[PDB]
Each structure stands twice: as structure tokens, then as C-alpha cells.
């Protein structure tokens, strides 16, 4: 069983989070951002679209994380 999301973080960092029932995107990336000295309310998170190279679609932080299982995300600065 693999309910995970690969996330490309700023400063060329990366993390793979685990998704559990009821988690928002904010709730599953909270810890990963904090320990790297980043606040969620200072970053834009995007989904990298399939069948392309650079296709980037902006997400809402309150998005259910289960919707993004198996996908690759990217967090940037503002």
C-alpha cells in the first residue's frame, strides 16, 4: 500500500509525505516545511501535470491531500 506524494521544495530540497484519511494539503506538508524553516502561509504550492515538462497548476492549501496521491508537487516562494 502506497499513499504518498512527492514534493519538490524550495532551495532544491525534496520530501515524500504520507497521506491519511481526512488530511488537507496543509496538514500533510506542515511538518516538512517547519523543520526546513518555512511557513505554509509564505509559499505557493503547485501540481506538476502529466504528459508535459513544466506544466504547473496552482493548488489551494486546504485541498484534500488524498486527491493528490501518486502525484508530484512543487512548493515555491512568493
Amino acid at each position: 500500500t502506497s499513499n504518498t506524494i512527492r514534493v519538490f521544495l524550495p532551495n532544491k530540497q525534496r520530501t515524500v509525505v504520507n497521506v491519511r484519511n481526512g488530511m488537507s494539503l496543509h496538514d500533510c506538508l506542515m511538518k516538512a516545511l517547519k523543520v526546513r524553516g518555512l511557513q505554509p502561509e509564505c509559499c505557493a504550492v503547485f501540481r506538476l501535470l502529466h504528459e508535459h515538462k513544466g506544466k504547473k497548476a496552482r493548488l489551494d492549501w486546504n485541498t484534500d491531500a488524498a486527491s493528490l496521491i501518486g502525484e508530484e508537487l512543487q512548493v515555491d516562494f512568493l
Binding site: 504518498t4 532544491k12 520530501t15 504520507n18 516538512a32 517547519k34 523543520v35
Partner: protein
């Protein structure tokens, strides 16, 4: 500036993440959240030299993708827990794995005995010293909980790369 790619390897639950996060954020992670893949970056000054540390925190439990990052890494932090005999015994396999991928017996490594704040010691310091001596690398005891030896472990690894 100089960029050092460090890889943290070892059995599950020895405190690889706790050590890394303690180094990066000065925070002790009390919970046990198993790692899949985590990379951290930090700018530090080591021995008068502005350094960029790129640290890869690996998964202890299985998972292959190991060979991939073992070719990238310039320095390896081999972690076991002093209250976990099995984890200490697993170190050899990690060393062999690193030895195969890089096709060398001269890879910059540091042996780390973590959780030295606990009294449930089953791995003696002398045992780990002997293991490290056979590899030609230093041995350092750490506690991610009390910050003891944490900076020293990582900085020693940088200084071992410099020798190679």
C-alpha cells in the same frame, strides 16, 4: 562555495531523521514518523569555510533506489542506536552496499552511535570503535535528544571528505 553531499543511512528507528532535524532546525522530533525520502539544505561555516550542506535522509525500512543515491553521495553517515544491537550489526551490510556502488574501500564515512542519552546500552563503545577501525573511519556517539555530538558527527563527515 563548496557543496558537500551527505547521505544518512542506517536501520529504521535509529534516529537518522532526529539527528538531521536537530542539526537543521535545533528541534528534537519526539514522534516516530518513518522516512520515505527527505533532502535538507543548510549553509554553514566549517573551519573558516562557508559550506553548503546537502543532506539526504534515507529510509531505514527496505526500499532499489538505494544504489541511485549511493552513487551521488560524497560522504556517508552510518547510524545505529546503542540500544539496538541488530541496527549495529546491520551497519556492515550498509558499508558493503556503499562499497559496491562506489567500487571503493576508501569512501568518506563516519560511524554514529545514537541515543547515547539512554541507559539501555547493548552496544559498547569499544565494539563500535573496532568496527569503525576496520573501515578506516571515525566513531562518534550522539544524542539527537540532547544535541550531544550532533554537530560533531556531521562536521567530522565534512572533514573526512576533505581528506579524500
Amino acid at each position: 562555495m563548496t557543496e558537500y553531499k551527505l547521505v544518512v543511512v542506517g536501520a529504521g528507528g535509529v534516529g537518522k531523521s532526529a539527528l538531521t532535524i536537530q542539526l537543521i532546525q535545533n528541534h528534537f522530533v519526539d514522534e516516530y514518523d518513518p522516512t520515505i525520502e527527505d533532502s535538507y539544505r543548510k549553509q554553514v561555516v566549517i573551519d573558516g569555510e562557508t559550506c553548503l550542506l546537502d543532506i539526504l535522509d534515507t529510509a531505514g525500512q527496505e526500499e532499489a533506489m538505494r544504489d541511485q543515491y549511493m552513487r551521488t553521495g560524497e560522504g556517508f553517515l552510518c547510524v545505529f542506536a546503542i540500544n539496538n544491537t541488530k541496527s549495529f550489526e546491520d551497519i556492515h551490510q550498509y558499508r558493503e552496499q556503499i562499497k559496491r556502488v562506489k567500487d571503493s574501500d576508501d569512501v568518506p564515512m563516519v560511524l554514529v552511535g545514537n541515543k547515547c542519552d539512554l541507559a539501555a546500552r547493548t552496544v559498547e563503545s569499544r565494539q563500535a570503535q573496532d568496527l569503525a577501525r576496520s573501515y578506516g573511519i571515525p566513531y562518534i556517539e550522539t544524542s539527537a535528544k540532547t544535541r550531544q555530538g550532533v554537530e560533531d558527527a556531521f562536521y567530522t563527515l565534512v572533514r573526512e571528505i576533505r581528506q579524500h
